[PDB]
Amino acid sequence: IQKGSTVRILRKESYWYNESGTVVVVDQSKVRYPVLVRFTKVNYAGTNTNNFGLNEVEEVV
Amino acid sequence: MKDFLKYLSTAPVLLTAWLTFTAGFVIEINRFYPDALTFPF
Amino acid sequence: SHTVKIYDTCIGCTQCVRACPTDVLEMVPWDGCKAGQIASAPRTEDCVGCKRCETACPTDFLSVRVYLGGETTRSLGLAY
Amino acid sequence: GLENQVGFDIETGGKPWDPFGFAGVSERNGLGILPHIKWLQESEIKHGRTAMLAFLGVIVPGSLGIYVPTYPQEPDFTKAFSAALQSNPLGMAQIALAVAIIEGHYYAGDFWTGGGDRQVGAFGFDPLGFSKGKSEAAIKSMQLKEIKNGRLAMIAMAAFASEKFIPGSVPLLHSAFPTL
Amino acid sequence: KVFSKSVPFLLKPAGLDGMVGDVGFDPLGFATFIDIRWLREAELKNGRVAMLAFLGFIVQEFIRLPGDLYSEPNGVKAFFQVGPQPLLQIFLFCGFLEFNMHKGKLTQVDMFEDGKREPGNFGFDPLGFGKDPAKRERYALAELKNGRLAMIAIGGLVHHALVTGHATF
Amino acid sequence: DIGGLNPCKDSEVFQKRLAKTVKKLENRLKKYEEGTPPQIAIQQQITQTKQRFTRYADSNLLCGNDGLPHLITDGRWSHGSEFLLPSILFLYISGWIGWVGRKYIRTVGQTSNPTEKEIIIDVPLAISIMTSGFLWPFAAWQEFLSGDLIASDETITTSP
Ligand code: CLA
Ligand code: CLA
Ligand SMILES: CC(/C=C/C=C(C)/C=C/[C@@]12O[C@]1(C)C[C@@H](O)CC2(C)C)=C\C=C\C=C(C)\C=C\C=C(C)\C=C\[C@@]12O[C@]1(C)C[C@@H](O)CC2(C)C
Ligand code: SF4
């Protein structure tokens, strides 16, 4: 995955679970949740972006 | 008359016009053929 | 006293600490995020349960969680 | 899928006639709620054979006057069932038992989801060697003839029922079967 | 500014350029918010239906068919005397024609979605009039003008029958 | 007949209801003067009442012991104009409404600002879609066949 890639959220406790988002940036450092994904639908708190782990996102073909 | 027509395209004005037209043709059907309990055919 | 837990989804944005009305949360060094900081709850005896801390949390499903528990004159906000 | 199955001929172009796409609804949403094409084809064969038998059974007794000796002489299929149900209860009971046994042995229930050891209307049943040794195209042609005759019998029986219910629905019917 | 040729005090309307009846007549700009191909298809169909219906009036009041049902010289009263059964058959036949002539795509969003469809071009030409392209444009313009005139006349005849009741004569 | 009811054309209580309503209207009519608009209005009321009662009598309508038309909605085509035909009419109209709404939602859902086009309707596109709903029974059984009518697993689900 990279910037601009489309991924499916696999985190169950997510307002965008099973949904598709756009990767903003994948951090190359040793952070726990490097993948930053932007969504079109705001969550219940109003935010439309979140940091996800490498195993919590699945790239769409 | 470019933004006025856009204003008339807003949800409230369009809904009011559509519901006014709808109530109008319903009321006029019931005036010209009143007391219709069953299908006319 | 109520129970406050911090989860590693913390991004160290400090919004929880600066929203606590009773000085329960504080920022401590960490190496799990870009900011290098994580929230801590070392003074939960002063926790009142107002949940302002998690109203300011930007992470998806929160990184600070307040579990209401036994009540105390401090946790009940009793000036009398 | 319909391109490689018996049933289509020159009457509907060269393509399988399926205006409503009913053959392709099994693969659609749901594990299985709509019949597979195999179930539909088995229903084809069963309904067509039953319709051919019923056409013979409304024509031969009602018109030609041929009757089994100890059976009611009723040239009317809307009353013959009950008349024989009272007159010869044992015969009707044995007919029902034979039908149930025949169907239970040739059960088509795995056809709903597709699959099974049998083929569509296999049934064995080739006593007088009509398909003893034949080319594959010949067997396919015979199967197509059977299916088309079954469809024609379906149409004839539906016409019988329609004329009995709505008079005048089939114009030539009473001029083609002058007796009831 | 160009200004329209038909309405000389109005600006030239857009979207009518490559058409066979363009006189610049669109003061309300119906071609701007409605597809021009659909508008021409609708104009041609309305015109053809109106022409057939006007001829139907004139023949009906004159000739009529044998039978008690078909005995009203007035078209409006003939619509009621004939009963629903003959009219519903005409409705279903017209529906069958609509389906087969447009080959499924019958709606405003479905028709002209793929293009390759000249507005009003059903390919119907058994007698062969129209092989010469020189007279084809004149025939198209004549058909359009006759259709418009027949729309006006069909309204006129129907409303004459309503306000008088006897016939057209 | 059906359910112990009787036709309203032979229901004495139905005619009693008609007579009582007409008598009340005429008594009201007595207290006004000449061809004044109140008398004209009351006379129109009487005429409409008589017409409505006559139409209900000659309508294959079954009346109970209270002299009121009862609806036979078991499904029989004999009383098909009471429920079945209005049922078909409503199903057509409501399917039209739902189809045009769904088509508009899916059409402006693929534009740059889908939410803007929901408070500020694209009247040209709206008119285009709305007049195309007359084929909603055919369009629905042409989109369901192609699998374009139903989503499969992109739909969101809660935690459990
Ligand atoms: C609950 C109903 C039920 C069930 C589960 C079975 C199960 C079975 N039957 Mg069976 N059967 C039943 C009723 C049932 N039968 C009835 C009522 C008859 C008529 C008397 C038969 C006659 C019959 C024969 C003749 C044969 C079987 C055979 C079989 C076996 C496998 C072949 C098969 O299914 O094809 C047969 C399939 C059917 C007969 C279809 C029956 C459909 C039923 C009537 C529908 C009931 C469903 C309904 C929703 C229940 C309502 C529940 C509640 C509301 C009351 C299998 C164990 C075969 C066997 O013994 O294999 C060695 C066999 O040859 N069955
Ligand atoms: C818009 C077209 C139209 C419509 C809706 C009607 C409707 C009607 N006509 Mg009529 N008619 C029409 C055109 C039309 N007509 C034309 C053009 C003529 C001149 C030939 C007639 C001559 C005519 C007579 C002589 C009589 C009627 C009568 C009637 C009434 C009873 C139905 C009947 O028997 O028709 C019969 C209609 C015809 C025999 C005319 C043929 C149909 C025309 C030619 C249209 C054909 C279009 C074609 C199939 C499709 C075009 C090609 C396609 C590729 C585009 C009914 C109200 C009867 C009536 O009630 O009398 C008062 C009657 O006696 N019509
Ligand atoms: C008004 C009208 C046309 C008006 C045209 C106008 C003003 C044109 C003006 C111009 O041209 C000039 C003057 C100069 C041009 O340079 C400029 C413009 C401005 C363009 C047509 C009506 C046209 C009206 C029409 C076509 C009505 C047809 C009605 C039918 C067929 C009815 C059938 C029924 O009534 C029965 C028979 C029995 C009923 O119970 C059932 C039904 C079915 C309802
Ligand atoms: S409740 Fe939330 S906000 Fe109030 S003190 Fe305890 S932690 Fe800080």
User: Would you state the structure tokens that stand for residue D143, as one six-digit string?
Assistant: 């199967």
Cβ neighbours of F148 in E, within 8 Å: none
Residue D62 and residue D79 in contact, taking contact as beta carbons nearer than 8 Å: no
The single-letter DSSP state of residue F120 is: B
The single-letter DSSP state of residue D131 is: T
* Beta-bridge mates of residue A59: A7
Method: cryo-EM
Portion 5-44 of F in contact with B at CB < 8 A:
none
Helix (H, G, I), strand (E, B) or coil at A8: strand
Helix (H, G, I), strand (E, B) or coil at F116: helix
| Residues near B8 by beta carbon (within 8 Å), at least 6 away in sequence | B14
The single-letter DSSP state of residue F60 is: -
CA A23, A25, A30: angle at the middle one, nearest 5? Answer: 120
**CB-hemisphere CA count at 13 Å for F5?**
19
User: Would you state the structure tokens that stand for residue E69, as one six-digit string?
Assistant: 């049902």
* Helix ranges, chain D (H): 37-59, 77-87, 89-105, 136-165, 173-176
Work out whether the CA dihedral F2, F8, F12, F18 comes out positive or negative: positive
Among A17, A18, A24, A12, CA closest to A51: A24
Cβ neighbours of E107 in F, within 8 Å: 131-132, 134-135
Helix (H, G, I), strand (E, B) or coil at F62: strand
Q: Is the CB of C11 under 6 A from ligand 4?
A: no
User: Would you state the structure tokens that stand for residue A11, as one six-digit string?
Assistant: 């985190």
> Rounded distance, CA E88 to CA E96, Å?
12
| Residues near D145 by beta carbon (within 8 Å), at least 6 away in sequence | none
> Rounded distance, CA E53 to CA E156, Å?
12
> Rounded distance, CA D80 to CA D73, Å?
8
User: Would you state the structure tokens that stand for residue F83, as one six-digit string?
Assistant: 């429920």
**CB-hemisphere CA count at 13 Å for D175?**
5
Q: Tokens 């490498």, residue?
A: A54
Among F48, F49, F71, CA closest to F59: F71
Q: Is the CB of E165 under 6 A from ligand 3?
A: no
Task: Tell which of C15, C31, C60 to mutate to test the A interface (max A CBs under 10 Å).
Answer: C60
What is the 3-class SS of D58-106, one letter each residue?
HHCCCCCCCCCCCCCCCCCHHHHHHHHHHHCHHHHHHHHHHHHHHHHHC
* Beta-bridge mates of residue B10: F120
Query: From ligand 2's centre to the CA of E126, what distance in Å?
Result: 20
* Beta-bridge mates of residue C67: C3
F86 Cβ under 8 Å from any chain B Cβ: yes
Site to probe by mutation for ligand 3, drawn from E7, E46, E145, E152 as the one with most ligand atoms within 8 Å of Cβ, is E152
Resolution in A: 3.2
Q: What is the DSSP string of E36-81?
A: HHHHHHHHHHHHHHHHHHHHHHHHHHHT--SSSSS--SSHHHHHHH
The CA distances from residue E86 to B25, D100, E91, in Å, are 29, 50, 9
**Partner-chain contact A17 F157, CB within 8 Å:** yes
Q: Is the CB of D107 under 6 A from ligand 1?
A: yes
User: Would you state the structure tokens that stand for residue F13, as one six-digit string?
Assistant: 């209580």
Helix (H, G, I), strand (E, B) or coil at F157: coil
* Beta-bridge mates of residue A7: A21, A59
Residue A36 identity (one-letter amino acid) = L
Closest ligand 1 atom to the C-alpha of D104? 64
- For D149: left if phi > 0, alpha if psi spans -120 to 50, otherwise beta; the answer is alpha
Q: What is the DSSP string of B1-41?
A: --HHHHHHTBHHHHHHHHHHHHHHHHHHHHHHS-S--S---
Q: What is the DSSP string of chain E?
A: ----SSSTTSPPPSS-TT-SS-S---TT-HHHHS-HHHHHHHHHHHHHHHHHHHHHHHHHHHT--SSSSS--SSHHHHHHHT-HHHHHHHHHHHHHHHHHHHTT--STTTTTSS----TT-----TT-TT-SHHHHHHHHHHHHHHHHHHHHHHHHHHHHHHHT-S---
| Residues near E5 by beta carbon (within 8 Å), at least 6 away in sequence | E12, E23, E24
Cβ neighbours of A13 in C, within 8 Å: 60-61
The CA distances from residue E1 to D95, E8, E21, in Å, are 92, 12, 22
Give the residue ranges of the annotated binding site of C for [4Fe-4S] cluster: 10, 13, 16, 20, 47, 50, 53, 57
- N-term to C-term CA, chain C: 18
Among F25, F79, F81, CA closest to F50: F25
C-beta atoms surrounding F103 within 10 Å: 21
